[PDB]
Design a protein around this ligand. Sequence first.
Ligand code: NH2
Ligand code: NH2
Ligand code: NH2
Ligand code: NH2
Ligand code: NH2
Ligand code: NH2
Ligand code: NH2
Ligand code: NH2
Ligand code: NH2
Ligand code: NH2
Ligand code: NH2
Ligand code: NH2
Ligand code: NH2
Ligand code: NH2
Ligand code: NH2
Ligand code: NH2
Lengths: 25, 25, 25, 25, 25, 25, 25, 25, 25, 25, 25, 25, 25, 25, 25, 25
Amino acid sequence: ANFLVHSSNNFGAILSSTNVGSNTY
Amino acid sequence: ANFLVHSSNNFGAILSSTNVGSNTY
Amino acid sequence: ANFLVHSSNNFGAILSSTNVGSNTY
Amino acid sequence: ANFLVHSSNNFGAILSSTNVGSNTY
Amino acid sequence: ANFLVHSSNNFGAILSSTNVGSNTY
Amino acid sequence: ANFLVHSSNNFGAILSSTNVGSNTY
Amino acid sequence: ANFLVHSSNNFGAILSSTNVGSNTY
Amino acid sequence: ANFLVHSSNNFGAILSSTNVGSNTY
Amino acid sequence: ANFLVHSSNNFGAILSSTNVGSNTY
Amino acid sequence: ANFLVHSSNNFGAILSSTNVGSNTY
Amino acid sequence: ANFLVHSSNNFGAILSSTNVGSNTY
Amino acid sequence: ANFLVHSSNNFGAILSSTNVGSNTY
Amino acid sequence: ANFLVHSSNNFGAILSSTNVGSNTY
Amino acid sequence: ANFLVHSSNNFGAILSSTNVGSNTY
Amino acid sequence: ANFLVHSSNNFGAILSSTNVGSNTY
Amino acid sequence: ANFLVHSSNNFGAILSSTNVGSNTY
Ligand SMILES: [N]
Ligand SMILES: [N]
Ligand SMILES: [N]
Ligand SMILES: [N]
Ligand SMILES: [N]
Ligand SMILES: [N]
Ligand SMILES: [N]
Ligand SMILES: [N]
Ligand SMILES: [N]
Ligand SMILES: [N]
Ligand SMILES: [N]
Ligand SMILES: [N]
Ligand SMILES: [N]
Ligand SMILES: [N]
Ligand SMILES: [N]
Ligand SMILES: [N]
């Protein structure tokens, strides 16, 4: 899996993942 | 899975994932 | 897996991973 | 796996990993 | 695995690893 | 594995490793 | 493995290693 | 393995090693 | 000035201040 | 000035201050 | 000035101060 | 000035101060 | 001034002070 | 001034002081 | 002034003082 | 002034003092 992101002063949340099982936030 | 995002001063939330099981936010 | 990110004064959270099992945040 | 990140005064959290098993945060 | 990061006064946490087994934080 | 990092007055934690087995923090 | 790091008054923790077996912190 | 580090009044911990077996901290 | 806020898992940005001079985000 | 905030797993940025002069983010 | 905050696993940045002069982030 | 904070595994930065003069981060 | 804080495995920076004059980070 | 803090494996920096004059970090 | 702190394997820096004059770190 | 601290394998620096005059680190 490749991860390429370009951010600049982001007050917001940037989520990007791949879960095979249960996950909690 | 590839992840390519371009953001700039985003006050909003940017969600992008793939869950196979249960997930909570 | 490759990891390339470019950030600059980001008050927000930047998540980017790949979980095969259960994970909690 | 390659890890290349460019940050500058980031008050936010920058997560980037690859877990094969269970992980907790 | 190569590790190249450029940080400057980062109050946030910068995580970047590759776990084959279970890991806890 | 190569390790090249450039930090300057970082109040945050900078983690960068590669574990084949279990690890705890 | 090469180790090159440049720090200056870092109140934060800078971890950078490569473990083949179990490790605890 | 080469070891080159440049520190100046670092209150934080600077870890950089390569373990083939189990290690505890 | 009083500051009372109640948040719970907010992916969005919550700004609330009072500037008398110029300010940039 | 009083500061009372209640947060729980907030991926977003929570800003709350009072500047009399110029400020940059 | 009183400071009372309750946080729990916050990936986001929580700023809360009062500046009379110029300040940079 | 009183300082009471309750944190638990916070990857984000928690700033809370009161500056009368100029300050830089 | 009273200082009471409760932290547990915090990868983020926790700042809490009161400066009457100029301060740099 | 009273100082009571409870930490456990904190990779982040925990600052808590009261300066009447100029201070540099 | 009373000083009571409880730490356990802290890789981060724990500062807690009260300066009336100028101080440098 | 009373001094009571409990540490265990701390790689980080633990500062706790009270200066009335100028001090350098
Ligand atoms: N969460
Ligand atoms: N959530
Ligand atoms: N979490
Ligand atoms: N956590
Ligand atoms: N943790
Ligand atoms: N830990
Ligand atoms: N540890
Ligand atoms: N340890
Ligand atoms: N910004
Ligand atoms: N910024
Ligand atoms: N900044
Ligand atoms: N900074
Ligand atoms: N700094
Ligand atoms: N510093
Ligand atoms: N310093
Ligand atoms: N110093």
